[PDB]
Symmetry: D3
Subunit: 316 residues, 6 copies
């Protein structure tokens, strides 16, 4: 296999993929500006990546399924208008499969994701709402938001799992290590984790090493008043919200790779998200696995709901 064939294929396909995201972001930025009366518009960038998953890769197919459940009332829990393009709009998906088929390695793939995020952010007034994909994508996304904005953000992170593994199966880019990568890089100050019910003792050392505010399910009843009155981002560049759908009890969100019984109810996430104070600069909804959902696609609907509510907080 010729080396300079793969290497210029890698260059050429990445460039054509990023140029598509650019023209799409440029189109939507221009649109929001012509309508006016908007400081921020939540912009959907899909990252259909599932190969960093330790169990099932079905995540890769989530973004299109979520956008179908978004755009199929048209009104969010607090009355923003979904058909208003100023509240929510689509940019596109990074064509992960086609980029990987060029032999691109994971480090460059992470860079492609980061560059995609910065293409969106460059077009005022778009702000990135990333659809996963597995949780490994949060690292490149948060990295991109921190670099573009010129400092750290605070994070609200819903998950069953801390995703703070220093070393997961020798895979630096594991969906079980993105917050390790994020904290190792200084991209976040505060990391507020909610839903946690699967945590190793080594990862409790990581929690201590980085000053993570890890809230476990076994103390949720004690924690509710705190969690329902979070205020983040004061004195840093803003607030980033990461929602891992496996944060929700498997009874209400079966469409995930990692079933962990004893999780959040839908209301738990909506109360916390709605009550959250701070300037939201970006967010993700990750680990929706359509291949593990029920036939009625209850988990696509839940995932779409969470995206709608994130967009209503982040659009202004």
């Amino acid at each position: 296999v010729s080396p300079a064939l793969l290497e210029k294929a890698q260059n050429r396909v990445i460039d054509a993929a990023l140029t598509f995201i650019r023209e799409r972001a440029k189109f939507k930025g221009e649109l929001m500006r012509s309508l006016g009366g908007v400081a921020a518009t939540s912009s959907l960038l899909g990252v259909p990546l599932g190969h960093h998953s330790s169990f099932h890769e079905g995540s890769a197919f989530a973004p299109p399924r979520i956008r179908e459940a978004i755009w199929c009332n048209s009104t969010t829990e607090e009355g923003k208008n979904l058909r208003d393009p100023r509240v929510i709009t689509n940019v596109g998906d990074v064509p992960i499969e086609e980029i990987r088929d060029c032999g691109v390695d994971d480090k460059r793939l992470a860079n492609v994701i980061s560059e995609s995020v910065k293409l969106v952010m460059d077009e005022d007034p778009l702000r990135p709402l990333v659809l996963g994909g597995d949780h490994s994508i949060s690292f490149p996304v948060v990295r991109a938001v921190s670099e573009k904005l010129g400092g750290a953000v605070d994070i609200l992170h819903f998950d069953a799992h801390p995703d703070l593994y220093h070393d997961f199966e020798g895979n630096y880019y594991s969906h079980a290590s993105p917050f390790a990568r994020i904290m190792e890089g200084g991209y976040a100050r505060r990391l507020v984790q909610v839903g946690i019910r699967s945590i190793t003792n080594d990862v409790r050392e990581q929690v201590k090493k980085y000053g993570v505010e890890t809230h476990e399910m076994r103390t949720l009843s004690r924690d509710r008043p705190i969690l329902e009155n979070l205020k983040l981002g004061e004195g840093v560049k803003g607030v980033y919200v990461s929602i891992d759908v496996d944060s929700l009890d498997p009874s209400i969100a079966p469409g995930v790779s990692h079933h962990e019984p004893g999780g959040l109810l839908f209301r738990d996430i909506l109360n916390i998200l709605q009550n959250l104070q701070g300037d939201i600069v970006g967010g993700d909804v990750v680990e929706y696995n359509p291949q593990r959902d029920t036939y009625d696609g209850i988990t696509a609907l839940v995932a779409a709901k969470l995206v709608r509510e994130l967009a209503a907080k982040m659009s202004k």
Copy 2:
């Protein structure tokens, strides 16, 4: 069929069965006794018996499905409160009593129950092992709790999670029904306190049974008032210790679809963990019953639910 030949088949096959259990318990006992730093080890004994169920016998297939889910690729090996399931001193498998092959020798249910009791005693004799039984339908708790009580030399207190009191005196003339284990236990005085949680399915004649044996039945319709007591139970003070029986049908069927008796309006997963995490007392044994893999979803969610109940019970009983 000569009765002679059948009787000798029975003795010999049972002997062979109990010797198998003896040798697995001997292995796991020596292992723990050579690791040291261990007062108790939760030790899985399967009793794959469904024939006492009133509606569906699928829980006979449960134990191997539960072990696989305990040891499942999507889960780490740490319990909610920090115990490492990779440490054998936290949890170990002994194995399954071969119910089907024994019944197939024409053994009657009284002798079958005796064989389940001997199995429990063979685990208990290998200190620091403590029996965490995997059912199987709920009928098995009678012979398990009889065996615990007889080996400890006295009464235990029981914390029992169920939709159903399982206190019938007489269910379809089957003494060993999955709906009378606790009538057998209470009749035998094998238990002092019996604290029942998740109850939402009870006939007026079993309400008699509750009053007659001074059973502490907590019904779902009084739960929110009961939370403060249930989150601070202290059992076993002045008897030989505490036995914890978890019927998976205690949980709402939205959580635990893989059961024979769907009863809407049940516990959430976290309600069992709150009670269990808060429970005080020397836990001497326990069981997880009525997982039915034939009624589970395609993803095996209830196997995972049962496996997590086993993991958190082991985390409490291991020491």
Copy 3:
């Protein structure tokens, strides 16, 4: 032909109402022969779905609910100790043959009148009280109209639902399943309307709520409203209390068998807490919007609808 239709319609409708009359009469006579009974919860199916905005499969619910009430996994005792094998606690009348009547070219206004008369035929047989199995939510309007007219005045309503069903005009359909409570409040048939489980509501509807003085409880305030909802006292000073249970009220994890899934709904124990604690003279009720064609393979939603019906019967029967 003009006449054929007019003719057919009347004759087919009269034979259908006659079948209900005979069944009600049979069950009334039995109860009065047994004695020691003031009220018997009496099942009347209205298998109607064509008023649904997404799926019409709730037309199949009634017989599936009835089967699940008397099914092999459960016992015949309700949570608080009533015995369902006593016909004075619960009894079946039968199903209005909606399909057959529609298929005669009968419009929705006439159909509403047939549903109304069928309910009166059950109420004409003391001590029966109507427990209607839907069918979609549109049925509650003609049912509540009948109960009101029959008792000679207003009822207070406890309504479980994901949706307010208070639209003035859901897409030009007066008998929409999203408008039955608009028609009830317009008609004067209800004084209080207590709605529990709401999580889907537009701004135009919030104004319908203020306009009729409706007590709309949304999911986002559920945890705070618990003490109110676990202490309802309805119907004092009017003809009594009607309980309408839209199965969609419940989280789809508990009740997947419905046409509109709405995440973040009631737990089954949330409905039972409210319903078991409700004080007031329950004069009738309905369990609507169970859709067997969206249920799971084990038919859990059938079992959920049956338990709602069993627990509502425990309260209305006396």
Copy 4:
């Protein structure tokens, strides 16, 4: 009370048969008013399941089948070009209210009489011919009895089933879904009985095949018998042809919605090849043993049952 049941039974049954008469009379008038028609396939549901040995959920089948016929993923043209939107091609009468008659304490013998009379009320309305929707297979006996009595002689029967249903005595139940064709042959209602799809017959029952001259085609011989089965000519020199289709005759891969799964059954195209080719005067027929409680989430067995009803109607209507 003795009188209480006897009187109710009679009045309830009379009101049920009156409803079926009015619906039959309405559709006969409709057809005669249109003209250009010798025969119209007329659906009579018989929602009975309790004559089953494993599951009773075939009681839910008729409305489900009707919905699947007049549905949305398909078109309305049969495979050889007949339009189902023409009422002269197919029409619904309605459902015998079996649950409600049985709930009056009516025994199976009188129940069979009710079914028989119901079929006869359809046959009294030129040009309607009965296409019965089960229900479990027990219903074929009262149906074929009625057709035989009404026409005044024997029919030939084409029967698709995984089981012969020629048990004299299945678990003491005279009206067993396992005994309908032993009752038909005993009574001389049928001359030929051509059974197709058989793959589950005990030797005792093999005796019964020879005892009554039954033409039983087993699955192991199907590929050899194809030529005969695709060239059937029935009814010559008697009153006509009755076609009974048990859905379990199909492979469970195609028809999972049945009570008794039997691997190695017919392909759907196996039934169409026989049915589209059959020569003879089709005078009635049935599609039984669809069980919606065992169907898949997409309700494919309901579609399978509907396409059988559609293709049988294509052949019976003229």
Copy 5:
């Protein structure tokens, strides 16, 4: 604002087409560097479902089909022994980003032209030949138009489908999935059109068949047609052979993951028998109408579509 759309639309389309060109140029140069190849089966996804009449879930199919092709329960050898691990046997180009282009307000004619141009970019890279993954059957018209224009003449088409897809006018959508072959035969892009598995056809569309000389083979004549169908020779006298495989051609017991369930369809082996024996120069093909949203939990239909692609590629690659 108008200039905004004109501007953006052309620039978003240009960037999409650029993407496909670079993938096709990479894949073409790879085969040319390996040598020993005359034709490489090259996957182009068209994830378009909005021309669907019942369900649009075939929009999600291409990436599910590719995962199944390269799945870890299957090995990489076709039935007749071609190694799919060899890029010269099967390669991926990519998906036309339909959603994203449609969300710039691009109309259906302009979309068809983007699909055609995409096909043309693959065909420009010797020795790539286009194997299109739908998406719904609408996509065959702009694919086959592109093929024909590119080659400068007609093709013969082998079409597998339950449905002729020959409507002139399906609900006023020119681009309906029920009309692609009307659009094809009307534009003279095809000479012979051989259809196999047909079992859903209206009398009007029967007209269309005679009108265009379509060689429609219906399921009800299959065994009579087998020796013809197992010895097809197409393309002789024109530019080559296009094969269109609609997944609903298979019986729903085998391919449940489709929008239109039509009972009594082809067995998997029947498509392979025909395709394994087909003579002529295959210049393109598509596998259409796999609907992941209607598949079973184990994704069986994805594997069914994947194997169809693998066996078409084995035949198209030389």
Copy 6:
């Protein structure tokens, strides 16, 4: 100490083989006391799935298959009465999980399987009918049948896959390699494969190397008369029948690890098995995966019908 492990191994395997011995000793005495029999098909489960390449759920098949056997009627297609113990009888399951959990390696495990089959055969008139379990178990079974009978057998083998890989990912004991192990050891003379439709070019060389009669689905119509008239065993010790449930089309046997579209119908196998001539000394039904079956357990019923037909051919 490693002495602790070796001891556990020796003593646990010894107890497990004594269990199978007492069960086989029981059923032998039962048939001999009953008389009128020369062969009784005796069920031995080998609940093993770790040699699987995709899913291990065939480990749970044996109990599920026995339950579907005695759940339908009670007469074999050719009128054998399955309530007659001389027609079919259960010995028991080899406790695979409990022997592996003592640290026993694959070679010693193959030996335990071989010894269990010999314990069955030592009891006249029992013949072993083995329930899998994945296809890897056919190697130790056929080796045991060949050693106890003192020579080779002919094999009829239904499968979608040849199972003739010399080296499957370094796993000598792969379920994709048992017939390579069997031919290498010379335990079989003829090997007639039916249902084959997944076959690599290196495995065609294995077919050539051992003179395997490999019938592919793409020649089934030409092969029918031949396959419906097989005569095996003349000149050798007899006939072994191996049934892999994935030989059947996935439409009728969805409960397997390896879906291969375009397989056999149920009659295809039944016509072949019923018409087969030769002295049947042994057989297996394998690769039933209960975890991938439909909610109704259709594949358990299929597998039970396959067992009943094989038990009717072998019992006499």
